[PDB]
């Protein structure tokens, strides 16, 4: 049996999002890619550095927004610009988000020497694709 990235069946009480529901073989078929850069295209360089930066950027956002992330973040690289698009629950006060956005942008722009912007779409609660 294959176990990779597969949320298993229980008794029909486990909420799963659209991203979680689909196993790896649905990548490029039903669900797209969370990161979009040019480093895995044919004849392109610096794939290892884009991949390492993404791993860190995901751990950073999880810790900086603990319990406030509704789904996995989406990373979009254009030129030297980095764009982080995160679905965030409406738990924290509004002014706290403005603090964490200013902090997380400045800190990650001085760490990777690129302009980094954070895009936050607030949801009332996690969106459930199906109950499995």
């Amino acid at each position: 049996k294959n176990r990779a990235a597969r949320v298993r069946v229980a008794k029909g009480n486990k909420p799963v999002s659209y991203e979680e529901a689909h196993a790896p073989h649905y990548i490029a078929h039903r669900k797209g890619w969370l990161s979009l850069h040019t480093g895995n295209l044919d004849g392109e360089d610096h794939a290892a550095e884009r991949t390492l930066e993404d791993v860190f950027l995901r751990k950073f956002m999880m810790g900086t927004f603990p319990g406030c992330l509704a789904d996995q973040i989406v990373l979009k690289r254009r030129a030297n610009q980095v764009d982080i698009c995160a679905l965030v629950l409406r738990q924290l006060p509004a002014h706290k988000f403005y603090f964490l956005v200013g902090y997380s942008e400045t800190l990650l722009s001085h760490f990777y020497k690129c302009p980094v912007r954070l895009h936050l779409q607030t949801v009332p609660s996690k969106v459930v694709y199906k109950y499995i």
Partner: protein, 101 residues
């Protein structure tokens, strides 16, 4: 902190080979030819031997940057097969999909 002590030794091997690259190039050039007297080549053969062993660039091993696994690594991403599959199977690698054909 690096992943383990094996990755730490490799990092030092990579930083000492960079310092001695020009030196080991200039000396080794004197040996890889047939135009110079063999006495000079025999003496250059020992000057290169006297350099520290960690300067030698064949003692570098490519290890997974995240788990320090010596074998199973893919050179384009610098990750082991186990670590690569975790990022790929979750949609986190840009443009990597499963191969159905």
């Amino acid at each position: 902190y690096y992943v383990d002590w094996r990755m730490l030794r490799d990092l030092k091997r990579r930083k000492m080979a960079y310092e001695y690259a020009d030196e080991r190039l200039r000396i080794n050039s004197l040996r890889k030819n047939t135009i110079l007297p063999k006495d000079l080549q025999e003496m250059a053969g020992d000057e290169i031997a006297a350099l520290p062993r960690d300067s030698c660039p064949v003692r570098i091993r490519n290890r997974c940057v995240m788990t320090s696994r010596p074998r199973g690594v893919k050179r384009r991403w610098r990750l082991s097969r186990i670590v690569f599959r975790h990022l790929a199977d979750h949609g986190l690698l840009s443009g990597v999909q499963r191969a159905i054909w």
